[PDB]
Design a binder for these strands. Structure first.
Lengths: 462, 50, 150
RNA sequence: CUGAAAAUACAGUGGGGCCACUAGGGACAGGAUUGGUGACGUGACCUGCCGUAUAGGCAG
DNA sequence: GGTCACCAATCCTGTCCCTAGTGGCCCCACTGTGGCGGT
DNA sequence: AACCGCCAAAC
């Protein structure tokens, strides 16, 4: 998927631009959030790790048993656990796939208390919102599990049609699905974390943030969401202003980013009149540069570290916290939600359970921007990996330094360096997937940090 | 249950009723006889297939 | 009728904008609204440790099937199939586009305050480093003069 | 301390003229819905007077 | 004082047409938005 | 020498 950027006189830009008549192609993978209709086990069968039939049914196994017996480097039992570490994540993925549609059904049945997409058609669909899956409560349904065990009989007809039923493990997969039930629900999990410290940490939840005309071109290769370095830079500017205002020394270490609304804005931007340079600098209009712009509504969760003296100095001043929230984002104008919305848009949290209890009330159509750990050696692997999964997107990760930092005339700072924008991959996970995957998964595998090293500065996990 | 085992719902809910909305036909009081009449026509349709 | 709601919790109302101008003498209540909101904006401009937002709504008594004049997009590479004149849109909660003004268009209107460029200047220019006049297409504070910003 | 700061796309506008969907037409044969069922007694609406009056008015 | 009885049933046999055709005329905008070496 | 000239074409 590619979108176009046109240039007026391409020969002035480069020879590559001149060869293509100024029409440069950029990777177009924006988030797709729809308000409308819900229209089966469908979401699993579609996720196709998953089910219906194949890629990769059937194990039928022999495959799984052989893998465990090979991993029996270090003692049959210790091997099965080492197999499980990858094979349990693989066995967890099978349950997560199966749950993708159970997630959708539940979801509907909340919004509704009425409906699915189609109430009767759902009731007809072998794995949809049944008044039996209706409950008991989430919590008691997971505590019951029972539903998960029953669905194993239904998985004699779909979630692998016929073959590979008693075969290496089906019992172990059923047990994992029965365990996932307990994880799938509610009023459970809760506590004990080396992150951040603890002496304590804080969680700053910014909700319903509206942005108008932010640069959709993250780097000049990729189009879609704004750059994560833009989100980092905004959060760092917010930290600096707060630490200089209050006289504290708190650190805004990591953030998680949830997009509610996204829309592409048509048209180019007209530059104002200025002294345009020549042999004689004249007051005129500069050249019209084509770009990509988006209107988006999002939530940020920022993870604050420091001393409790500084944290309770921050918590004591809510107006001064609100005051230094920036109004710039990726070139666009950034506003708090409307004054008649009745939304407290700048909230602090001391514990994780209270924050997750607030966070699972988000709109279900919205997308979590999630970090991945996929490896890419060239463009063709990335394109195959993009043609594989429909919810992955190529985005800006950060800067690979070309030259050595040194004193250069016209530099903003003491040392200047020329760098190259690095292309990575993000995941647009649904709100429901993050809700069912549990509090631990969310607080470990949703938060971005800037790995600032000698020769590169890249956005990554942890 | 389907294989004869009592499932545990309230002891008070077993003596509980169902509301039935029926139509009822009774003879009016002090009407001695009722009448049922139908007409029967017979045709010779079993000699030849239609 | 212009309604202004503030993050502070104020609620200002101008009843009819046809009765106001830049140079005309206003009523007392409209001057009170000006005074109060000017104080709030000045407080927001001068103190870094206060948050200040405002929701500003104009309610216009429409004529029967009256024409609306929103922002027009910049397009110098229009195709044969497309419209030569298009409008700036904002997508709603559903898949419907409200016709809208650009932020810079509103910004340009609010900062049309500069009438210091002459001793008896009637026109108010949009604040520019060289006092650029869009209608005439000249600089009112030219680069060769001492009236420009630099 | 954000592929960093800053940014008014605008003015004008006549789709018009003409117009025949038509002709023809078998939905048809057969049919057992059936068995079984308690609306109230933890409640206010009482006790009297006037009046020819199951009319109509009144006292606690 | 409160609920809206269970036990099974959804029919088989045959077909959706033929003819002919979707117009002429004229037109699709003016303003602005360039860096760089040289005579 | 300050000001007319040279230069591109993808689906």
């Amino acid at each position: 998927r590619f979108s176009n950027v046109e240039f007026t006189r391409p020969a002035a830009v480069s020879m590559l631009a001149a060869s293509l008549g100024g029409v440069i192609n950029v990777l177009n993978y924006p988030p797709y959030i729809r308000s409308k209709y819900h229209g089966s086990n469908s979401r699993a069968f579609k996720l196709n790790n998953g089910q219906t039939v194949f890629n990769v049914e059937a194990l039928l196994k022999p495959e799984l048993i052989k893998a465990l017996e090979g991993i029996i480097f270090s003692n049959n039992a210790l091997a099965l656990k080492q197999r499980r570490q990858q094979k349990v994540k693989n066995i967890k993925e099978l349950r997560n796939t199966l749950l993708e549609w159970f997630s959708p059904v539940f979801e509907w049945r909340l919004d509704a208390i009425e409906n699915g997409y189609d109430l009767e058609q759902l009731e007809s669909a072998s794995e949809r919102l049944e008044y039996k899956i209706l409950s008991l409560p989430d919590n008691e349904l997971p505590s019951l599990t029972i539903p998960l065990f029953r669905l194993l009989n239904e998985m004699l007809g779909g979630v692998s049609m016929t073959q590979r039923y008693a075969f290496h493990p089906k019992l172990m997969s059923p047990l994992k699905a029965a365990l996932q039930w307990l994880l799938v629900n509610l009023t459970d999990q809760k506590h004990v974390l080396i992150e951040e410290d603890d002496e304590h940490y804080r969680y700053l939840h910014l909700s319903g943030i509206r942005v108008f005309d932010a640069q959709a071109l993250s780097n000049p290769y990729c189009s879609g969401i704004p750059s994560l370095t833009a989100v980092w830079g905004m959060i760092h500017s917010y930290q600096r202003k707060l630490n200089e205002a209050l006289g504290t020394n708190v650190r805004f270490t990591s953030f998680s980013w949830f997009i509610r609304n996204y829309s592409a804005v048509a048209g180019k931007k007209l530059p104002e009149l200025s002294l345009q340079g020549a042999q004689q600098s004249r007051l005129k209009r500069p050249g019209i540069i084509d770009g990509k712009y988006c209107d988006l509504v999002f939530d940020l969760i920022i993870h604050i570290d420091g001393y409790e003296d500084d944290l309770q100095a921050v918590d004591s001043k809510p107006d001064i916290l609100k005051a230094h929230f920036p109004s710039n984002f990726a070139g666009g104008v950034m506003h708090q939600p409307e004054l008649n919305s009745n939304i407290n848009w700048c909230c602090l949290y001391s514990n994780e359970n209270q924050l997750f209890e607030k966070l699972r009330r988000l709109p279900l159509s919205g997308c979590w921007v999630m970090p991945t750990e996929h490896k890419i050696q060239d463009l063709d692997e990335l394109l195959l990996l993009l043609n594989s999964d429909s919810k992955l997107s190529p985005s800006m990760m950060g800067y690979m330094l070309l030259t050595e930092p040194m004193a250069r005339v016209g530099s903003l700072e003491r040392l200047h360096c020329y760098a190259e924008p690095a292309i990575g991959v993000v995941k647009y996970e649904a709100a429901t997937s993050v809700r069912l995957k549990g509090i631990g998964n969310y607080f470990n595998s949703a938060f971005w940090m800037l790995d600032a090293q000698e020769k590169f500065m890249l956005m990554k996990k942890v | 249950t389907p294989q004869f085992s009592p499932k545990n719902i309230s002891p008070q809910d077993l003596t509980h009723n169902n509301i039935l909305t029926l139509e009822e036909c009774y003879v009016p009081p002090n009407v001695e006889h009722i009448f049922c009449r139908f007409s029967l026509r017979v045709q010779a349709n079993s000699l030849v297939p239609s | 009728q212009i309604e202004i709601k503030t993050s502070k919790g104020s609620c200002y109302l101008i009843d009819n904008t046809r009765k106001l101008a830049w140079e005309s003498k206003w009523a007392s209540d409209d001057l009170k609204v000006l005074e109060e909101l000017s104080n709030e904006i000045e407080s927001a401009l001068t103190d870094p440790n206060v948050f200040w937002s405002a929701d500003i709504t104009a309610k216009i008594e429409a004529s029967f099937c009256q024409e609306i004049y929103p922002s027009q997009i910049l397009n110098d590479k229009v195709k044969q199939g497309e419209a030569s004149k298009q409008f700036v849109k904002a997508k709603c909660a559903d898949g419907r586009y409200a016709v809208s003004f650009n932020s810079v268009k509103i910004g340009a209107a609010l900062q049309s305050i500069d009438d210091w460029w002459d001793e008896d200047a009637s026109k108010r220019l949009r604040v520019h480093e060289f006092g650029a006049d869009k209608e005439i297409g000249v600089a009112r504070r030219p680069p060769d003069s001492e009236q420009n910003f630099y």
